[PDB]
Every structure is written in C-alpha cells, then in structure tokens.
Design a binder for this molecule. Structure first.
Ligand code: FZ4
Ligand code: FZ4
Ligand code: DTB
Ligand code: DTB
Ligand code: CA
Lengths: 596, 596
C-alpha cells in the first residue's frame, strides 16, 4: 500500500534523527551541541536524513532559527539544498520556513540568496485525495495559501514570478480557489493581482489551466461562491443609481455559451462537483437562465414532447393492430393447458386496411433511426438512455419482423412500456410534478437495485419453503405454486399483497402452510413499514430543498443541450451585443434590482 | 424491603437525637448546653446513637465546629470513633468533615491525630444503583470526589496513600472516572498524580481494577470521554508540525487487541453500557478501526457471505429435488379432502441422478456441523443464533432422514427460511441498507412480541365471534372458517387484508356477519394507522443518527470477532512496531490532521 509507505518513512525518519547527533541537535535546537559537532569534531555537515533532508531542513521543520543560523554560518551551502526523496522531491529549506510563516527565517534565508523558484514535485505535494492539503510547488504559492501577506510581498521583492504554474498548470490564482479559508483568500487574491504587468493584455486572471480553465472559470466548476462573487465585481458595469433601483450591466462573456465548450454554463452541467450547482443561483447567472427557459426553452421542449407523445401513441397504434391467424398449428400439441391463437402473417397482402399500417410502421422505423441519429454521438437525464434502447428494440422487432419468429412479441412488448414511461421525463420542468419524477428517478436507479436483494433474499426462503409443502399436494386444487419459478412468482405477488393467499376451504391445507404463511405475512409487513420509515430520512427540510435545487438544475441541464443541438436560426443569443453601442463588443445583460 | 429499612432508620435516628439532650445539643450546636451536660453533670459522652454514631459524628453532620471542639476538648477519644451500624459501618468523624468540606474541622481533626485510612464499609457507601453517589471508602477518595483540592493536599500532607483501593479494588483514580463533574475531575485527577513515586514503573495509572481494568481502560468501557481524551494526552506522540498539518503518533497499546481479552476494543463491544459506543469515535480509535474494516475486514466478510449464500443455495437445491412416490397409501382414507402423494423413498437406489444429491447433502451436513464447531464455544449480531438453530434443524432433518417419518418436511421446511433470511445479516456494513436491516433487527426481536399480544387479543374476539355465526351455516358455500383454528386463521389473514372477506352473493349471509366484519374492518384499520404514527417516535433526527451510530458499531462489532477467530497468518497487526525504530517497542499509529 501507498498510505503505509509514508507512515513507515515518517517513523524511519525519526530514527535517523535520533541516531545522528547532528540531526538530533538540529531537531532539539541544541546550539552548543552544534558547535561541538561542527567546529571541534568535523562531522558530516551534508548529512542526508531518511527523507533526503539536510540538517537545515530539520532546523526548519521545527522553527529553530538559532540552529538554522549555526548551520547556515558554518555551511551556507545548505540553503540551496533540496530534499532528495520520492515523497519530498524538490522541497528546499525556504519552503519549510514559508509554510511555518517564520518571517525572520524567510528574510534571513532570502538574505543568504535562496531560490524563489524551487519546484517541490514530491508525491506528498500532489493534488490527490490522500493528501490533506494542496498548496502547489513554488514558494510563492505557499506564502499565498497560508495567508502570510508579509511573506507574499517579501518573496515578490526578491523576484517572485506570479505567472509561475505547477505540474498541473495552475497559477498562484488557481490554487487560491481551492482553499478552505475563502473569506481570507479574496484579500490574498487581490494582493497577488497588484504585482501584475499593468497592461490590459496578458493578465494573470486570463491564464488558462491545463484543462482549459481561467481562475474565474475554475471558481464556477469548483463551487467557490466567495471567489465567484469576488471575481464578478471585476466584470460587471453599474449603469445608474435611481434611489433604490440600480440597473447593473453584467459582462456575460465566459458565462454564456460563446465557445464550443469553454463556456462556464457547459461546465456546471457536466461536472461531478455536487457543490457547483449553487453557482447558477448567483445574480449574473440566475436571471440569465431564467430568461433562457421561460421563452425558447420550455416551448421547444413541449414540441419535442408533443411530437414524442404523438410518435409513441402512433407506435402503440401499430401494436394494438397486428397480423392475425386462428392458429395454423394443429392442436394444443405440447400440453393440454395451451391458450394460443398464433398471429403470424408473412404475406404483405390484406391490401385494404394494411396500407395504413405500413405508414405507422415506416414512421415508427424512421422515427427510431432518427432517435439513433441524434444520439449516435447522469446529472439530469437518465430516462433517455431508455429511449435509445427502445429504438434498438423496434429495430430488433424489425429484425424479428420479416423473419416471423415465435417471439415477435417480446421486443415489441418491451418497446412500448419504455416509450410511454419515457414521457415521464417531460414532467421535468413543466410544473412542480417534475420534482416528484426526479425523486422517483433518484429512487428507481439508486436504491431499488440495492434494496431488492434484501427482499429477494427474504422471498427466497419463504417462496422455496412453500414449494416443498405443495409439492405433495395435487396442484389441481390450490395450485398457487406447482413449479419452482411458479413458487417464486406466487410468493412475489404475495409479498406485495396482490394475491388473496392460498385460500381453499373445500380441501384441507398441509400442516406447514398456515405456519409459514403466518410468518411470511408478518415478516412481509414489517419489511414494508420499516421501509416507509426509512424514507423519512429524506423528509426534514433540506431534502425537500435538495430535491428542488437539483430539479431546477435538471431543467437548466436540459436547457443548454437543446441550444447546442438546436439550429441558431431560432433561439437568439442572450443579451444585446456591444456593437452599435458604447461598449467593448461584448454581449452583456441588463439586471436591475432593489435594496432596502 | 431494603429501601424502607434506611427510611425507618433515618427517622429512628432523629428520635434518639431529640431524646438524648447531648445529641440534641450536638445537632443544634448548643454550646452552653454541652458544658452543662459534660462539665457539671457527667453525662455519657460516649453516647451511641441509633446509627452507631457519636456526639462528634452528629457535631460533624451539621457543620458545627464549636460543638465539635467542645466534644473534642472534653473527650478527644471521639475523634477515633467509627460508626458501628450496618448502613455506616466504619465511617469516622473525618469522613463527615471531608464530605462537608469543613476545612477548618478537617485541619482541626488532623491536628487531633485522626485516621487518614479509615475504611467506610457501610452498606450505604456501596456502588449500588439504590445509592445515589459512590465516592469510595477512604477519606482521600472523598476529598477527591468533592473537588476540595485544599483537603486533598491537606490529607496527603498527613500521610495519605494514593495507592489505596476499596472493597472493589478501585484506586482514587478509578473512582474519579465514575463522577458527573467530568470537567472538574480532570483537574483533580492530575492533582492526585503529582503525589506518585516519580519512577516510570509501579505508577498509579497502571494499577488494574479487580475486574482487570486500569484507570485509562475503565474510562473507555464506562464512556467517560472527558477522561478518555484527558488520559490520551499522556500516550500520544507529536511527530512534527508543518503549518496546518500535525502528524501525531498515538501510542496504541491498551487500545489494540494485544492481549487475549484485556484489550479495550474487546470491551466496548461486549459491554452493556450504551454510552461506551462513543469511545470508538475518538481520534486514536476511529481511524484505527476505519483501516481495520476497509481492508481485511470487509473482503473476508463477503467471502464468508459468498460461501454462505453458495452453501444455502446448494442446501435449498437439495430440497427442491427430494425422494418421490405417487402415494403408496391406498386412497384418501381419512377424509375425502386429501391432496397427498407421499414422497418417501427409503432405498438408497436410483443410482443415476441420486449420486449428485448425496454430494449436496454431505456438503450440507458437514457445512452444518462446521457451523456447530465454530459456534460450540445481542449488541450487533442477533441473526446468527438463527444459523446455529438452523444447523440443529438439518441435523433433526438428518435424524428425520433414515427414519422416514411423516414429518420429514417440517424441520427441513423450517431450515431454509432461516438459512436465507440469515443472509440479511450480511447487509450489515456493506452499504447503507445495513442501517435498514438493524432497524428491522431492533423491531423484530424488540417490540414485535409485545405488540402481537395486543393484536392477538383484538383478533381473539372477532375471530371467535365469526366461528359462532358460521357454525350454523353449511361450510360448503362460504366456509371461510369451519374449524376453530380455521376461524382464527381466516380472521388473521383478514386482519392484514390478505383475504377478500367472506364474499358470497349466491347465498344469503347471516345477520351478524355484516355487523361484525364492518366493526372488524374499521377496528383493524385504526390499529394499523395508529401503529404507523407510533413509528414516528423514531423519525426525528437523533433516532436516524442512533440507528446509524449503532450500525457503524454493529460493523466494528463483527470486525473484531473475525480477527480473534481468524488465523494471524492473514490480517497483519495494526500499526508499525517500535522495533528497528527509535521507539519503545510498541506499535503506534501515525495520524495526521489539519486545523483551521
Ligand atoms: N440526449 C439524451 C436525452 O437526454 B436529455 C438530457 C440531456 C442532457 C441534460 C439533461 C437532459 C434530454 C435532451 C433533450 C430533451 C429532453 C431530454
Ligand atoms: N458467532 C455468531 C455470529 O454472529 B456474528 C457477530 C458476532 C459478534 C459480533 C457481531 C456479530 C457474526 C460473526 C462473524 C461473521 C458474521 C456475523
Ligand atoms: C517528513 C518531511 N521531512 C521534513 O523535514 N518535513 C517533511 C514532513 C512535513 C511535510 C508534510 C507535507 C504534507 O504532508 O503534505
Ligand atoms: C445517618 C448517618 N448518620 C450521620 O451522622 N450521617 C449519616 C447520614 C448522611 C450519610 C448518608 C450517606 C449516603 O446516603 O450515601
Ligand atoms: Ca381476491
């Protein structure tokens, strides 16, 4: 394991500190023990420890400016020494002094001429979940994350480049977005901005991440509202103040779907960050998408819904009327219990009333490949993998067609439950019953699978037990379960109280039926009542707000995909462009509000 | 009764105080009445009261230093006098002065040369639930429990032994753990430690209780978090401080399963203390068992689960296919209503397809005695008394086998509902549906038995009433209940709405059926609705946290038993031992955290 390797190496490091009297005197800050170990007896001052550290590195882990200065006066070359381990590859003595905010040592290390651009590419300095913090690689990134504004400027004064990026291409601004202390990071964020070039171009706030993210755009996908609101002040214009009213004009550039995929809107939808959903409730974004859905969002959705409901109600019209035959097969040849009148007609005759059937089938088959075409190239959708697999079923039904298989029904019967139950996805948005469907959507594809095993397991015993009892009995009277699958099915219906239970009084029931079914009834009811109380965890207030906050996000989810895949002839661009206006050729939204 | 004996003796004591003018003057602190009762008229100064108390004992129950000093100047032998009753056997006048924190009297009693090692073995000083407090037996234990630090040192200054134990072998540290004022007891706990011998061995914090508990270990089983966190500071090492990070190295000695049963982990599981469950959420213990379950805990659990599900699905495979016969018995000899084709085959023939059946039966019979073997030698388990009794049933089925009883089915049919429903115990841990199973586990074995009587009682009337009505009627048409057990069963199903009710319209029903069943339906529904509202007591927030805190404890419950009964070849010891490291040969866990 990797988690224990750093546990062992930390214990292994403390051994070498205790064994080496130099590293011990540099940990314990034993000043008089350093002179007797360097001036009188010439000990190895370049003594590398278990982590590739030096005596000065240990003199810095524990703030010991006295031991650090003795090690820097008798060996000034220790200042340039980086750690040479796998976990701490590249960390210098300045990194340790900046993290500990030892301003006296950082200023005394910078007087010794320490490197202000030493990358710390150790495996413990990575942006991984197993690492508690992530400050970056440069000594300037460390000063900015610890909030030590004195060291931030003290490092800039010695030639610190704010443009510097780490192995992930993150500037000193991208890292500040990924910090807990957000209220203090905005102050530090402005401190780093005051050292920019000053010109309007090649600014630091525009350097893109290696995954295509500016510091403004990274704050949106990550869900940093304190940095989102702070970075929004730099890109919004206040038109006028008229008493309480103040019509502010937001920039709207990286916020709208201007680029093919660099847009911030396209990032909030497709991200795994649960917290990023709260960005769209900010005032530059909420009234934007509010205007995107009321008009040109909801109508085109319903058209796609009315077409779909019309398409499915015509596809089902082709099912209720299918070929027919009074069973060309001879008699009940297999078993006497056979109720079959096989409906197989291979000939394309019956020309009167069958010509209309080909129209619906052609519509159903071109309307299905169209669904494949638009989907040839989960947050708020699930239901529409079902439509894609449905059109696969009508194609398999088409393969089952013109071959006249016995199972012409099975993919067809599959097809229309999916197609109608898919209409339920249109209830999203529309009205309040959308939040009801997504509670279902969360429950169907979420805990139904994991909960059914528990029921299947409890059903397993009682269902199989019943089969043992009635295997003796003649199934003519009370043949509720005569086969093993029939034993599990009749008990499955009995677990949901959709069957009256084995109730035969003309005969006498076996001894173990009344004992098992009494236990089964009581167990099956206690399973359902504790299940309802288990649903009360999603009942207090936040969950009613959580099912509503992700529904309104599920609507914005469906809204932006339409715009990307609908033609731009319809659906004009949001805002009023900055050309033919005293603006900078941007698009910009007018938003007026009132205060108290 | 014993509770009234101390009520009578307290009233009996006040009688002797009022009757005896000395004890009255020592209660009322009547100074001038003591001189006229001792110096002028020689009264019995050794006058024993109803509780074996002296005049000085009464002069101390009510802080009366004036009356105490007159009784100690005219009779200094009263200082050594203990109480000679059954309730207060051994209590001296110093105990009363220490409890009342009369520092002036304790210092004046210690000047008189009072005993600082007088055991108070009275029945009221016992650690029993009927006694409100429990401070111990020694006068030093009393000073430490009342927090009077002045008297604690004032008693030590006169030769008080901190090592002293009471009749339960509890030191002055073990008693401080069992106190309400925890925030003030830690200060007193350190005060008692500063008087130790100073050497690292034979310390007071290591003296074991008479039930094998050190003061550190007693705080865990009792659930004293304030003393657990306080006693943990003495056994955790801080490796380094790197800005926000601080990797502390906990001792991990009495916390891990080092001993056969002296471990603290093995005590939190098997204890009745409901509050001790919160110890495992403390930082030296929570991340410990978190690493014990994710690896080497959960996989071995599922292997035991996959084997069990495979073992049971093979045992049930032996049931669905059993011996067969088209009923060697003649006809429906007893009653015409008989649907029997008895399946009894005594011969071990049918060699083709029966040889495989013996393999499953042999597996099912060796897999059952194996279950007995591992269990030949309740918190978080219940479900697995069921597995033990199941393997008893397959043995009784084996006894029923090779004897060819009519009831070859009954223990077999019993066996497989238990065996499958036992799989539900594997849902513990695994995922979130574990908390659902334990809510069932609490409900099945908790209130189901006590609630059923109420239903059986309400069923009793309506079920028996129905039998009276339909005893007249010919049971051929609407014979829902023709027998007395059949009367209770059809009504039992009717109480859970698993039967359509006596619905026959070709005939005319008796007068009292429609009147009773209408009352039965309304009563049966009001029974179920008030039952669902009765489940809302376990719905507000703490219960959802309580069903979750004991589930996560139910997982740790199952985890430690595996380690004790699984071979040590697999499952390495937690931590990294202190040999080949600058440590004290302990094992120790590295735990790094971040602050704000
Ligand atoms: N492309 C798969 C369909 O999923 B739907 C969807 C896609 C992305 C985000 C949210 C929902 C959908 C798309 C258009 C109209 C209605 C629903
Ligand atoms: N020994 C009786 C079985 O009870 B189980 C159990 C025992 C102690 C604590 C918690 C649960 C159990 C043991 C091992 C695996 C699965 C469950
Ligand atoms: C062991 C290393 N040697 C040292 O002198 N400091 C390091 C320890 C503290 C740095 C930990 C950084 C982290 O955990 O992210
Ligand atoms: C009655 C006894 N006689 C006395 O002088 N004090 C006792 C009464 C108070 C002690 C009660 C201790 C307890 O209840 O635990
Ligand atoms: Ca019915």
């Amino acid at each position: 394991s990797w988690a224990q390797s750093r546990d062992e190496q930390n214990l292994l490091q403390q051994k070498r500190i205790w064994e080496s009297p130099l590293l011990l005197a540099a940990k314990e800050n034993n000043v008089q023990a350093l002179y007797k170990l360097l001036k009188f007896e010439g000990c190895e001052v370049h003594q590398k420890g278990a982590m590739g550290e030096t005596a000065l590195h240990i003199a810095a882990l524990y703030d010991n400016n006295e031991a650090a200065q003795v090690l820097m006066e008798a060996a000034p070359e220790l200042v340039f020494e980086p750690m040479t381990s796998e976990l701490y590859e590249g960390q210098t003595a300045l990194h340790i002094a900046v993290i500990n905010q030892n301003v006296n040592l950082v200023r005394a290390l910078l007087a010794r001429g320490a490197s202000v651009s030493a990358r710390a590419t150790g495996s413990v300095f990575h942006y991984r979940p197993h690492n508690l913090i992530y400050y970056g690689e440069h000594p300037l990134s460390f000063a900015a994350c610890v909030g030590s504004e004195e060291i931030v400027r003290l490092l800039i004064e010695h030639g610190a480049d704010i443009r510097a990026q780490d192995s992930l291409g993150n500037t000193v601004l991208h890292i500040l977005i990924l910090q807990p202390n957000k209220t203090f990071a905005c102050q530090m964020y402005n401190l780093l901005l005051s050292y920019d070039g000053g010109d309007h171009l090649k600014s630091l706030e525009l350097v893109p991440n290696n995954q295509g993210l500016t510091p403004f755009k990274l704050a949106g996908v990550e869900g940093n509202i304190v940095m989102f609101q702070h970075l929004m002040q730099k890109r919004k214009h206040i038109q006028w103040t008229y008493g309480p009213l103040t019509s502010t004009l937001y920039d709207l550039t990286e916020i709208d779907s201007s680029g093919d995929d660099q847009s911030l809107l396209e990032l909030i939808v497709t991200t795994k960050k649960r917290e990023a959903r709260q960005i769209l409730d900010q005032t530059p974004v909420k009234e934007l998408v509010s205007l995107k859905w009321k008009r040109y969002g909801r109508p085109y959705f319903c058209v796609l819904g009315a077409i779909y409901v019309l398409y499915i109600i015509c596809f089902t019209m082709c099912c209720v009327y299918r070929p027919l035959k009074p069973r060309i097969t001879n008699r009940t040849n297999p078993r006497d219990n056979t109720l079959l009148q096989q409906k197989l007609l291979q000939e394309a005759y019956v020309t009167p009333k069958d010509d209309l059937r080909l129209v619906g089938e052609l519509v159903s088959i071109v309307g299905a490949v169209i669904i494949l075409l638009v989907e040839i190239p989960i947050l708020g959708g699930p239901f529409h993998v079902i439509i894609v697999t449905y059109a696969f079923m009508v194609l398999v039904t088409m393969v089952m067609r013109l071959t006249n298989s016995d199972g012409e029904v099975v993919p067809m019967s599959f097809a229309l439950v999916l197609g109608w139950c898919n209409v339920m996805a249109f209830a999203r948005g529309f009205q309040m019953l959308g939040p009801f469907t997504i509670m279902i959507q969360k429950m169907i594809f979420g805990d139904l699978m994991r909960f059914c095993w528990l029921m299947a397991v409890v059903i397993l015993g009682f269902a199989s037990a019943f089969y043992i009892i009635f295997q003796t009995e003649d199934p003519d009277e009370l043949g509720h379960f005569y086969d093993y699958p029939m034993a599990l099915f009749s008990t499955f219906e009995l677990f949901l109280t959709i069957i009256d239970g084995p109730a035969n009084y003309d005969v006498d029931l076996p001894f173990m039926y009344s004992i098992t079914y009494a236990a089964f009834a009581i167990i099956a009811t206690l399973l359902m009542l504790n299940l309802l109380i288990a649903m009360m965890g999603d009942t207090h207030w936040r969950v009613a707000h959580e099912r509503d906050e992700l529904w309104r996000a599920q609507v914005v989810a469906t809204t932006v995909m339409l715009e990307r895949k609908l033609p731009r002839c319809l659906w004009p661009r949001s805002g009023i462009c900055g050309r033919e206006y005293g603006l900078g050729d941007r698009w910009f939204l007018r938003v007026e509000d009132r205060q108290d």
